[PDB]
Amino acid sequence: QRTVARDITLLECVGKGRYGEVWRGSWQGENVAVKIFSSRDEKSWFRETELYNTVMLRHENILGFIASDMTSRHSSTQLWLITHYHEMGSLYDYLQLTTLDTVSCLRIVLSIASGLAHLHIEIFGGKPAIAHRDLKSKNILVKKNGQCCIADLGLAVMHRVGTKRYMAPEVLDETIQVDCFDSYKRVDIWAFGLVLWEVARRMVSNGIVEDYKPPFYDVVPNDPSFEDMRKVVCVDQQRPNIPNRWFSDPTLTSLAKLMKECWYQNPSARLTALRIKKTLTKID
Amino acid sequence: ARDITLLECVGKGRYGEVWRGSWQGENVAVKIFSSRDEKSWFRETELYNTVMLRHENILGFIASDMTSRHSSTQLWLITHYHEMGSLYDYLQLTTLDTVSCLRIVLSIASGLAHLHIEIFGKPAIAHRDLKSKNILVKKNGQCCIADLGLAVMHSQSTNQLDVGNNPRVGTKRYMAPEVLDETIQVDCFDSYKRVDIWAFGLVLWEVARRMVSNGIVEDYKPPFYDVVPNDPSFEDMRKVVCVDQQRPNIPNRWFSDPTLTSLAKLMKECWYQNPSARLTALRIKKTLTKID
Ligand SMILES: COc1cc(-c2cncc(-c3ccc(C4CCN(C)CC4)cc3)c2C)cc(OC)c1OC
Ligand SMILES: COc1cc(-c2cncc(-c3ccc(C4CCN(C)CC4)cc3)c2C)cc(OC)c1OC
Ligand SMILES: COc1cc(-c2cncc(-c3ccc(C4CCN(C)CC4)cc3)c2C)cc(OC)c1OC
Numbered sequence: 001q002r003t004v005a006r007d008i009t010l011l012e013c014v015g016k017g018r019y020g021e022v023w024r025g026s027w028q029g030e031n032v033a034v035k036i037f038s039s040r041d042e043k044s045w046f047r048e049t050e051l052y053n054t055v056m057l058r059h060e061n062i063l064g065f066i067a068s069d070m071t072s073r074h075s076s077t078q079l080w081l082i083t084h085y086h087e088m089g090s091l092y093d094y095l096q097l098t099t100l101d102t103v104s105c106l107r108i109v110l111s112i113a114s115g116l117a118h119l120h121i122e123i124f125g126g127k128p129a130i131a132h133r134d135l136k137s138k139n140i141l142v143k144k145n146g147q148c149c150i151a152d153l154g155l156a157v158m159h160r161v162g163t164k165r166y167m168a169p170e171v172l173d174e175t176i177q178v179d180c181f182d183s184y185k186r187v188d189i190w191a192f193g194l195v196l197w198e199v200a201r202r203m204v205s206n207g208i209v210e211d212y213k214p215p216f217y218d219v220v221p222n223d224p225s226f227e228d229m230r231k232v233v234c235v236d237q238q239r240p241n242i243p244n245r246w247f248s249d250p251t252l253t254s255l256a257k258l259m260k261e262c263w264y265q266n267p268s269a270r271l272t273a274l275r276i277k278k279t280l281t282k283i284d
Numbered sequence: 285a286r287d288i289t290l291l292e293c294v295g296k297g298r299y300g301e302v303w304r305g306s307w308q309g310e311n312v313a314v315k316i317f318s319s320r321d322e323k324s325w326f327r328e329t330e331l332y333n334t335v336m337l338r339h340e341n342i343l344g345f346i347a348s349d350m351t352s353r354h355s356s357t358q359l360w361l362i363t364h365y366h367e368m369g370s371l372y373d374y375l376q377l378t379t380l381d382t383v384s385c386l387r388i389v390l391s392i393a394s395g396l397a398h399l400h401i402e403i404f405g406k407p408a409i410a411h412r413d414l415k416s417k418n419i420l421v422k423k424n425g426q427c428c429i430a431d432l433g434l435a436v437m438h439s440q441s442t443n444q445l446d447v448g449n450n451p452r453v454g455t456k457r458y459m460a461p462e463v464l465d466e467t468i469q470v471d472c473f474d475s476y477k478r479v480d481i482w483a484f485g486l487v488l489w490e491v492a493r494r495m496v497s498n499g500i501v502e503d504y505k506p507p508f509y510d511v512v513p514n515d516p517s518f519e520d521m522r523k524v525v526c527v528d529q530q531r532p533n534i535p536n537r538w539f540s541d542p543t544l545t546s547l548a549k550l551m552k553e554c555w556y557q558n559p560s561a562r563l564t565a566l567r568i569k570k571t572l573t574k575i576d
């Protein structure tokens with residue numbers, strides 16, 4: 001009746017971690033990304049698969065799903081997640097080989113806000129509300145049209161822990177109301193504010209730019225402990241530095257105010273993804 | 285090599301379709317789920333992730349896939365192919381001698397005991413939709429159990445029970461009294477094993493009817509064929525099993541044969557209304573190992 005060409009040629013490894021590996025692959029002449037999970041992180045494959053089995057998310061700012069594959073091996077299970085391939089790589093990688101003008105800085109952050117507001121919002125008829133729970137520049141891909149898309153729904157919740165560098169105060173101090181879905185949206189908004197800070201630093205104004213640095217680069221070690229982060233974020237209540245040079249630029253002044261309204265200690269005071277999108281459409 | 289050719293449809297219901305396919309020259313079974321049963325696909329995928337699930341009397345897993353473009357999703361389970369089909373099919377076209385009757389029912393008991401018993405690995409597994417259509421016949425004369433889409437997992441070792449998330453219920457005709465009257469204790473793993481033992485008793489009865497003794501054999505019939513309408517509803521089955529307290533009739537010719545006399549005793553100890561009085565899968569396997 002019909003042939004099912006399932007052969008994906010794995011061409012080069014574009015990512016490796018504890019989690020497993022991502023490969024650039026070829027299916028029918030067409031690039032795909034293949035995430036091969038470690039046995040240690042099987043739960044992230046199951047959670048992303050269960051989510052996509054519940055709702056087939058389709059959004060220009062969400063990494064495009066192609067397939068979940070489980071293949072039986074002699075004495076193990078092989079778990080692959082297959083998605084759209086973005087040759088420009090992660091925002092993390094990208095911010096380290098370019099600076100940004102005002103148009104490209106706004107296009108990036110508005111696209112991430114659009115992807116996040118799409119996750120957060122319940123649609124009837126539709127989709128459940130979704131919180132990401134591991135938003136960071138490494139989990140955002142850059143597209144050729146200058147918009148981004150959000151990747152990695154292995155920790156997502158519908159209505160492993162977060163990267164410690166990006167954890168909100170209520171996660172570090174264990175006061176998060178874990179039976180309140182809104183609590184998880186507020187944790188993503190905190191993380192969003194740090195990504196906004198990472199991008200805004202690489203936007204040029206009056207001939208000046210900051211070097212790419214991760215959030216809290218100046219106050220915590222590489223691979224910060226849970227304790228290291230709690231002391232900075234909860235006990236001392238430190239926030240990322242806004243450089244003086246931003247206050248000469250109308251875009252970076254508005255973006256400083258935005259990222260501040262993502263970092264309130266009180267989660268319920270933080271802006272929503274929808275309110276961030278509205279603010280970004282009125283900037284410039 | 286991952287490339288699969290779909291050669292013919294061997295089955296089709298509201299569940300979806302099964303196809304005979306070719307994959308590396310070998311026959312494979314490809315099940316394509318309806319979107320209405322997406323929760324069974326995911327649950328079956330969870331169950332086949334258990335590497336110690338593999339057993340001669342459990343349908344062998346090859347791959348599971350969810351594939352999507354735009355708003356369209358396909359859900360695939362790929363297994364080993366059994367060209368003799370299901371026990372339900374086979375029992376309609378053949379009678380059985382003693383040796384073949386015991387080999388079939390011992391092999392089903394052996395698969396079920398494998399599911400039910402924790403390995404310290406593999407959780408304890410209750411199937412919850414055991415029936416002759418979910419049992420495939422192999423060329424060595426043994427059977428394997430298929431369809432883990434309703435299965436419940438338990439570990440005594442970590443005190444965890446995973447009932448999963450599937451609104452699907454068992455085939456009505458094979459439902460235990462406590463399933464039909466909805467008094468089944470949902471947070472008790474032992475409850476789900478006891479539901480499997482009930483259904484197993486019905487499968488034993490379907491098989492034993494086809495074993496010849498003294499030149500006599502019954503026609504193939506499904507459980508409760510004589511007491512409910514065609515395509516019985518949940519309420520139809522609750523009436524006969526719960527209100528009327530019916531159980532399958534033991535043909536009197538069985539009492540002339542030592543094997544069928546022993547099997548009649550066995551299946552009746554699967555059918556107590558008190559779930560805790562029913563035999564365990566391991567006891568059934570040990571009893572069938574000693575019967576000849
Ligand atoms: C199983 O596995 C993989 C499969 C595929 C794949 C390859 N060709 C064709 C398909 C296909 C899509 C959709 C239909 C429709 C047509 C009829 N309609 C009424 C219902 C169903 C049929 C066939 C698929 C799904 C790709 C893979 O990798 C990219 C697979 O492995 C992950
Ligand atoms: C965050 O996580 C996931 C990411 C991806 C993913 C998707 N497109 C492209 C990429 C990528 C490609 C290429 C480079 C490099 C290599 C070539 N050059 C030297 C610079 C650029 C970096 C990154 C990735 C990593 C897929 C995933 O799943 C299948 C992910 O997990 C959910
Ligand atoms: C998973 O991913 C990809 C899949 C495919 C692909 C291959 N065969 C068949 C199909 C297909 C055909 C028809 C229907 C529908 C048509 C409307 N209605 C009647 C229900 C059935 C669905 C699916 C597809 C989508 C191609 C891709 O790209 C070229 C894919 O992306 C990598």
Ligand SMILES: COc1cc(-c2cncc(-c3ccc(C4CCN(C)CC4)cc3)c2C)cc(OC)c1OC
Nearest residue numbers: 294302313314315363365366369370373418430431
């Ligand atoms: C129950 O469940 C699953 C079963 C199978 C499966 C495996 N081998 C062989 C079969 C088969 C072949 C052929 C016939 C014949 C019999 C009668 N004749 C008039 C028409 C057709 C019947 C059955 C099947 C149906 C695969 C599955 O998944 C891939 C199943 O789901 C878990």
